[PDB]
Amino acid sequence: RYKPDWESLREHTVPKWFDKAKFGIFIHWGIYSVPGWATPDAWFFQNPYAEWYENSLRIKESPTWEYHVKTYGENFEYEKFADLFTAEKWDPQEWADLFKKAGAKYVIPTTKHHDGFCLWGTKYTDFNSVKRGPKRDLVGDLAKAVREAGLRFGVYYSGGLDWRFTTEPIRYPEDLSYIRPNTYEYADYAYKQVMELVDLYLPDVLWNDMGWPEKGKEDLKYLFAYYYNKHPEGSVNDRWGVPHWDFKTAELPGYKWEFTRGIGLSFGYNRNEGPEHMLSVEQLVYTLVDVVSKGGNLLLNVGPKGDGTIPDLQKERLLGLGEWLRKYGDAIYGTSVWERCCAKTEDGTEIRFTRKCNRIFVIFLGIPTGEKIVIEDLNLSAGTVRHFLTGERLSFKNVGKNLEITVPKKLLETDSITLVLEAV
């Protein structure tokens, strides 16, 4: 049993499933998906993030304001998008199947982003998906489908920012130091809402954002102890601004962390986003391997449309990643870091290392065109280095500081995207 104080909650280390998961799906989906628009220290004036539509719209000068006033009209309040957000062609089982085939082991939707619209039937505001728009508990139905597909389910919550409680926009990063809800009322509201998510859906991950209101930071001792006592395999990110977290986030470490990025640049759906603002399947795999070899997990974001469909370009990149993970999944899932993160060849091709007990997977970022491969600054523990995908044994010798190794061309042609070897 966890007690409600920081010393006691430190006893909760990161759960084993999360360290082994390696890959998860972020989902940025709200009423901001309806307009789904964004421009292709002037960051907030030309916000490339479609989720920040309302903030950009509150800046009268901006291109989001130009677009909005021409597409929808000057007197079209942002709140009106809630009724346009009908998710009429949303099938959560189809999402869960997509994410499972993509190779993800956990899924995290935005229960409530900065605009403050909640994607569940919360009883603390009427600005949610049950009373407005979809007339449907989006979080709960996604949680059911995700878990029926055999995946873990987390929740993103914008604890630090809620624009239902402000009127002024963020124009500069320094504005965030005072343009917050700021009231005791909000501190209670955020506490009750995350407590409600825990009670209703018992998430495997509590992914807070933008810090936690200062007035309720000491509430989290009670929230975290409550959560862990109901769900010891539950986890908590590092965006609460308090002494406790299970893993860190980012946009060889001894702690666990998680790199988050979108398939594109924007997190929410953006129409203005060209097909060359997005990563290729190759770049997604390279990111996954790089991150995972450094002890991290990848949280890859998906920005679905307001009608509940995932853009074909995004579906494509997910399935292509999962086709790669279906072949090379044994060298990623359930792996630890090796003695070192990275390495390169004499040629130039970068290399990453993942361990799985006595095995050491050697993952080349790319497929070398030559049979004779020379890896710099490595002298392997004289064992048995073998081709991974076919299993076939391979000859190799040590040379001063580098490591020479021949791999026939007949085997290179089998590998897709990355050549991977495996020592013992």
Interaction partner, residue 4 (a second copy, ligand FUL, none; CB < 5-8 Å by kind): a second copy
* DSSP annotation of 133: T
- Return the structure tokens found at 187: 């501190």
Based on CB atoms, which residue is closest to a second copy, 202 or 412? 202
- Least separation in angstroms between residue 269's CB and a second copy is 31
The residue whose Cβ lies closest to ligand FUL is 51
Interaction partner, residue 393 (ligand FUL, a second copy, none; CB < 5-8 Å by kind): none
Interaction partner, residue 205 (ligand FUL, a second copy, none; CB < 5-8 Å by kind): none
Quick one: which segment of 3-11, 201-209, 262-270, 409-417 binds a second copy (CB under 8 A)?
A: 3-11
Q: What is the per-residue binding string for ligand FUL in 50-69, x denoting contact by CB under 6 A?
A: -x------------------
Based on CB atoms, which residue is closest to a second copy, 131 or 356? 356
Q: Which helix (H) or strand (E) holds 95?
A: helix 92-101
Residue 81 in contact with residue 299, Cβ under 8 Å? no
Q: Is 357 exposed, middle or buried (0-12, 13-18, 19+ CB in 10 A)?
A: exposed
β-bridge mates for residue 261, sequence order: 300
Contact call for residue 248 and a second copy (CB under 8 A): yes
List the interface residues with ligand FUL, window 11-40 (CB under 6 A): 28
Based on CB atoms, which residue is closest to a second copy, 208 or 349? 208
Contact call for residue 270 and ligand FUL (CB under 6 A): no
Long-range contacts at 240-243 (CB < 8 A, ≥ 24 apart): 240/159, 240/208, 240/211, 240/212, 241/160, 241/211, 241/212, 241/217, 242/6, 242/212, 242/217, 243/6
113-97-389 Cα angle (round to 5)? 115
Q: What is the per-residue binding string for a second copy in 206-245, x denoting contact by CB under 8 A?
A: ---------x---x-xx--xx---x-------x--xxxxx
Order of all β-strands in the sheet with 106-112:
235-236, 205-208, 152-157, 106-112, 23-27, 296-302, 257-262, 248-250
Q: How many residues does the chain have?
A: 424
- Least separation in angstroms between residue 160's CB and a second copy is 14
β-bridge mates for residue 112, sequence order: 118, 157
List the interface residues with a second copy, window 156-175 (CB under 8 A): 167-168, 172, 174
Interaction partner, residue 209 (ligand FUL, a second copy, none; CB < 5-8 Å by kind): ligand FUL
User: What are the counts of helices (DSSP H) followed by strands (DSSP E) for the chain?
Assistant: 12, 16
List the interface residues with ligand FUL, window 188-227 (CB under 6 A): 209-210
Contact call for residue 258 and ligand FUL (CB under 6 A): no
- Separation between Cα atoms, residue 213 and residue 236, nearest integer Å: 17
The contact set with a second copy (CB under 8 A) reads 1, 3-4, 6-7, 10-13, 167-168, 172, 174, 177-180, 182-185, 187-188, 191-192, 199, 215, 219, 221-222, 225-226, 230, 238, 241-245, 248, 253-255, 357-358
List contacts with ligand FUL (CB under 6 A).
28, 49, 51, 209-210, 260, 267
